[PDB]
């Protein structure tokens with residue numbers, strides 16, 4: 001259902017139950033062959049740990065930025081909230097976010 005990306009020391013969570021209307025492929029994208037179901041931060045994938053790095057190797061980049069070939073966590077949440085200001089706050093705000101729990 002909803003996992004916590006914490007191999008050792010790092011809080012966060014993704015509930016597969018609240019995202020049932022999205023195709024698995026949108027997130028688990030087809031790369032250099034087929035759809036890979038491995039963790040996003042493995043060796044040879046998104047392992048770069050510097051936030052100024054905007055290449056496809058960046059970790060902070062693929063989770064927070066807006067201009068990308070595949071929609072990011074923040075990228076898709078903006079379209080979903082639309083004109084509801086109270087809801088845009090809850091899904092894209094930095095302070096006290098449910099994404100970092």
Ligand code: HEM
Nearest residue numbers: 003004005014019022023024026027028037038039040041
């Ligand atoms: C579609 C119904 C769907 C499938 C299938 C799928 C599978 C899947 C697996 C096997 C894992 C576990 C990997 C592990 O052992 O850590 C997993 C994990 C994550 N998923 Fe997923 N997933 C499906 C759907 C979705 C959707 C639509 C998204 C994006 C909103 C998504 C995202 C992720 C993420 C992030 C993880 C966590 C990986 C981690 O680093 O812990 N999944 N999924």
Ligand code: HEM
Nearest residue numbers: 027028031036038039040044045055056062068069070071
């Ligand atoms: C884990 C479910 C996962 C996420 C989340 C994710 C996101 C993601 C984005 C948003 C991009 C766009 C980058 C850009 O600058 O436009 C992107 C691109 C690539 N990814 Fe990825 N990705 C996830 C997982 C994986 C895994 C497991 C690997 C390693 C096999 C991987 C690799 C790549 C590569 C390569 C690209 C670029 C592909 C291209 O068209 O050149 N991703 N990912």
Ligand code: HEM
Nearest residue numbers: 013014018019022026063071072073074076077080098099
């Ligand atoms: C990126 C890996 C990512 C994370 C992390 C994430 C988290 C997240 C949370 C915590 C919620 C809030 C649920 C709650 O209130 O308990 C949530 C909800 C929605 N999301 Fe999401 N989400 C991530 C990725 C994505 C992507 C890429 C999309 C779109 C393709 C997406 C969509 C949604 C939708 C829909 C919701 C529901 C909003 C509602 O009206 O309840 N998320 N996400």
Ligand code: HEM
Nearest residue numbers: 005010011012059060063073074077091092093094097099
């Ligand atoms: C608001 C734009 C915002 C900020 C700023 C922010 C910061 C932040 C940091 C510094 C990290 C740690 C990076 C590292 O590698 O050490 C981090 C991690 C994650 N975030 Fe975030 N974040 C902000 C907002 C959001 C929102 C609204 C979401 C969900 C839609 C989101 C998601 C994530 C995810 C996933 C991670 C990785 C979690 C992990 O593996 O520990 N952030 N964020």
